[PDB]
Amino acid sequence: GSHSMRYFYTAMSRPGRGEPRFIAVGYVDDTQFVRFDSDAASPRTEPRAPWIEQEGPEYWDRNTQIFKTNTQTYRESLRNLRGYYNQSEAGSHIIQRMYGCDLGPDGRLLRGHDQSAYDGKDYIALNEDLSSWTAADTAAQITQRKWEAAAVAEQRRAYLEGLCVEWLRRYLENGKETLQRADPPKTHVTHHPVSDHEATLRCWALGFYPAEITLTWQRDGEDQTQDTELVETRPAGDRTFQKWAAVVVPSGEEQRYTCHVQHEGLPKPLTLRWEP
């Protein structure tokens, strides 16, 4: 199927409590495979998935150098953005970067991403052309100009179209028995009266990978979007994810309701009803 790799950097200042923490995590789809944390006792890139462990010392050292240098640069960047926004030295701020590459079912590059935020708001993003920038405000425009002057987009593009895809494909092969395995949701519908005239139907999806899933309730074949309580897909801690969708229905009308489940790992989409 389609696959992506993403790295997520968080740099978080904390005036009076040392230098800003830098943490990087890397993912292939919904599987984290690496971390680096500048607050670790001995900061080093560490494996977080079994299939990355086979990478040799040169890989780990290369990662660690990248992250150690980025740690220092992000501290400069935090100082710089504080200035761009005329902010006091007192406050704690956060720069986030998410970037990486998306492959289609054929393994070819679909597109690259390289997005940054400051204090949780869009700051600057590499456009899909991987050649131009979108700056959110006049502060981010300073970064844009700086990055234009330093030919930064070319660096990002070279990575996104080159090493990003290369290494993603490598990981996909090395971890193929998990990364390229979709585990379908195990499903059931529960029923809980809420009163004498209403009951809750809850449609469960458990044990699925990847996280992407569609779980909906229909009444008489019509989507009950507004009436459905849909919890965020949540990790089980064993790589799989869980989700449920609930609707409160008039007692006696339960069979008018169907839960529909779409997921990569299902040989076919599910239609489920309460089974008393």
Partner: peptide, 13 residues
């Protein structure tokens, strides 16, 4: 693999 360091100075924001 994350984005490698550029040949010159990594550009800050």
């Amino acid at each position: 693999l994350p984005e490698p360091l550029p040949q010159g100075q990594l550009t800050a924001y």
